[model samples]
Target: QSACTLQSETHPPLTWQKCSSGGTCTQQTGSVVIDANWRWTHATNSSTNCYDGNTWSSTLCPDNETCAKNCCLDGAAYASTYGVTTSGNSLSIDFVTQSAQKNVGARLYLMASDTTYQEFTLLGNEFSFDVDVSQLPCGLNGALYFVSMDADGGVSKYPTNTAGAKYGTGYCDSQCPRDLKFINGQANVEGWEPSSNNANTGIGGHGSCCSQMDIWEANSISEALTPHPCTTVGQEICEGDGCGGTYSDNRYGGTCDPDGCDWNPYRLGNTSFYGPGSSFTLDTTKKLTVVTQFETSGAINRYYVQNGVTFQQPNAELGSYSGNELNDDYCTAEEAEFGGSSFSDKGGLTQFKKATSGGMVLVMSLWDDYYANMLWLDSTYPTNETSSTPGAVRGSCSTSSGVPAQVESQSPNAKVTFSNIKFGPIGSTGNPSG
Candidate 1:
């Protein structure tokens, strides 16, 4: 037999054949064909119908009236055309549309390369674009891809237009206020007088001068660790700058330009005092002494003495002060003469009485050379609490029956007997005795 030949059919024409009933039909080639005469019956109230070669059925068509009136066929025919293919793996898309606002713009790519893809900015309200992916390498395959405009100014991607497609909206606001500003009528200087209010305005006094003053005072107090200003006399005097040349009245008010005051008279022999017209005078005989005491029932006990040494009990009948009292009192008298003060015939004891009674027990005896020695009564003395033994023995005054007056003496010249005995006077019941 001659070789059987199979000839490729040209575009097969679709023929409508009449059917016997409202059912389906299968052609000899096993292809479905619809009969034209059969009436479509469906719950959806479809009026359109279709006919296979042996049966009749309803035509499932798009709801558009134009589609229905056309017997499920459009007058225009769709045809595929061939185009030139690009060489390398690349794709380029371009979009142009009439109104991008109404109809969204998009670029579609098919069988795109994984390597490189070209993007285009969307324009107009409704738009269409052409993507040339013919340059992609052969054998590459992927679903259709599209980049479309969203309701907002942003762009999105989608494989299809169903609700599941990736979509984004609500872009960032563009017209918010750039920055805050000082509005008119918001700021005013009603009660703030420029002369008194030394703040922000450059026309006023120094910036934060009051605050700086407060800071300076705070720093001063902090440095002192006391609730007092550092520049004051009480604290400064106690801080060793007291009668020093830097603090002496003559040197304090004198010319500080050339050399500072030379009146530091705290020591025994610091006699260089500021004289008239800021001149210096050194008195050879000047000296100073500090005498401190506490009163007991019978006699006064000198507690501490500094500078030259001697101290005197207040009563004259107590006789010329000897021991530490005499040494300190002698120094005081000597310092007084050196300080250009009159030395009394009654000895330094007279000066001591006056100084203590005047509430000037915290005394600085000044000598001729302007040397100043400081002393103060310290009634509180070392008790058993301050002694080496813990609750072993309590201190008692010599006025006790068995206690001897000489035993109360704290001076080196006095002979006393007591083991671990620390001496001090009892404080007055009411206010301390003058």
Candidate 2:
């Protein structure tokens, strides 16, 4: 889309680490930029809104091509408007920001520079980060994941886009969300449907799809490590029901795997493993360091650290699966036992490796789901299914919990902080004691 020169964009400074063998780790400087969807888009010559309150202005955005030429993305206010802040190495995102428009959630990308995103090649590396989620509740998700997106934010690929990565353009995920205001540098105004329950969100005719590796999707009580592979690679566009994720009539009718092959101990029938109080091994009241190792041999392992002690992920208690790590064998068994077919149908571990080899961009966000109420993450999913089913019971949360309206109103001050990001070969970023 056309970019306006009215407001100069400045990213928040952040620092991370890159390590090698022999325990040598060096600090690398970077910055963070919010998604373009969070920025205000208006007419090029005036203050008239191109998109306001989840609807497009007919006068400014008469058609997709016209909107691309007429509208321009404005700079973000960061802390004041979107509740995003960075101090040293840490980045914190608030659940709600009471600005003039009342922002509810935010998504951000790691900027290599003002014009490009940091692309991570993870096939033979380990990624670790420190996170504090004490204020997050049942319905909220403080997520750190990787997706295959263009480093230039589709600016070179789609000539209509001039805002580029400076404005955090070009985002896609396995979910193939249709709520994006722009796709392929064109306004997603065709057949736009305003959300029934939310005033700030709506579904557009086009959806963007890509592979995703979820290192963390968690809150105070529940956590998950998921790999959502797609049959295709890079940012792809689709129409309506063909989009096939949270926005479509059928959740799994499209090209990507919606219900990813996940590794959530609580969901695998170890309900007492991760939660509050002394009975649980990983307490949620304090800060924790999480490490994920992606081996060249195609295995992924997870570890958690708190109070100077490192703990390995728990083995699955379910009868059908026993391993704690993720690989082809684990995902295959997961589908067989959980009555799932999408993970395999979408090409499984083979496709996942291809996506990783192609490089990916880091995305961190705090959000509440509108489709499933996050029951698929923290409560009994497919609420119609009974607890006796293998994958039916996820976390201990009640089915009635996690409503967006309830959580948004009750926990408006909720937030999550992520810091100390590090990447290196296996065994490089974990506990120093190791």
Candidate 3:
């Protein structure tokens, strides 16, 4: 904001202030293990990850269609037992909540070519998870994350649970491909819990897009620009850089004018439009580590994961992205969602990018937000109208009673957990060899 410089408390502690004008933007953090990359195979209901040749099937994906976790609720092929386990470098996930006011949407991912479809090939930039919200459940509203997409002509390889193409719909507003989250209370995590009510609960890294074509990030270090707003039509104006050309973009009725009518040249820059930056501590409830890195010329770094037996990325600098303003192919699908907030807003990133592609995938989740439930991130939260069966208004989880220990094992109500997960390369602390 004046070329930024941050320190963070609630954040805005900017930082960018001086890259001058060309090179030197590799701001990174190290320490790694658990890029758990290269492990994926699930068959929604339809079945098939695709290749047509190497063969893999939940029925059919790789763009043949039908595999968004089985066209989700409608295609009616529901086969989600969303719990996982792995030993060695460590990976563990569990989702419990058929009660405490049940409303579910679960996801787990790890991809990078057990034959590739939703496609991913990270190899580093740090991704480690040794998370244990101690039992996670303020009342649902968790979102452990990392995602990669492929929109544009690939149509996210065929995403659709219908109605504007669901899967956390429009991947963050519109023009797709621009996400790196780690939210904790998108709303619905009751009365704090053992800790973190930082005056209303929050835990950073949000990042978004779709403000029709937006771009902003100039703390200035060296001043590189990407004005964002040209999204595919015939993608002319010097063709796609920082992803601001080519019109069509979606969520319905999308255009960038420039002389195209609904469109008209508006490539401006500066971020934090609606969401980005969040914080709360107790170090995300102890034993935690989360990282997202890209810097191969498209900086998308966010880190957290401190001292535990060796590994130091001390996770600071919660936001920074510009993979060409986040157009990495245009985002098709990505997952991790807890529930409620209209059932993870239905489709949960098109059922966790189930058509198949590979590299990054690990989405532990939780949700509640009655659409932000009165926002301060849901201060005095919890509601569902007592299950009021009207217009889908549902929610109600109360382990009630001065609960602590992160929730005395969290008595029933949208539970989410992930441990020592991993993805590599970014200032390296170690954990990527192959």
lDDT winner, 1 or 2: 2
Model 1: lDDT to the true structure: 0.16
TM-score of 3: 0.23
> How much is 164 displaced in model 2, in angstroms?
0.7
Candidate 2, backbone clash total: 1
- Candidate closest to the true structure, highest TM-score: 2
Worst 10 residues of 2 by lDDT: 425-434
Overall lDDT per candidate, in order of appearance: 0.16, 0.88, 0.26
Over 1-434, each residue of candidate 2 has an lDDT whose tens digit, in order, gives 87886777889998888888678788888999999898889999998889998799997788888988899999988899889999988999999889776888799999898889999999898999999989998989999999999999999989999889999899999989889998998999988899988887899989999999999999988999998999887889888888899988888857888878899988777777778767888888888999998877667899999888878888874445577888787888888888878988998888888887878999999999887788888888888788888888888888888899899889999999999999888888753422
Lowest lDDT 10-mer window, candidate 3? Answer: 1-10
Give the distance in Å from residue 314's predicted Cα in candidate 1 to where it truly belongs. 20
Every model's TM-score: 0.14, 0.97, 0.23
**Cα displacement (Å) at residue 59, model 2:** 2.1
True lDDT of residue 233, candidate 2: 74
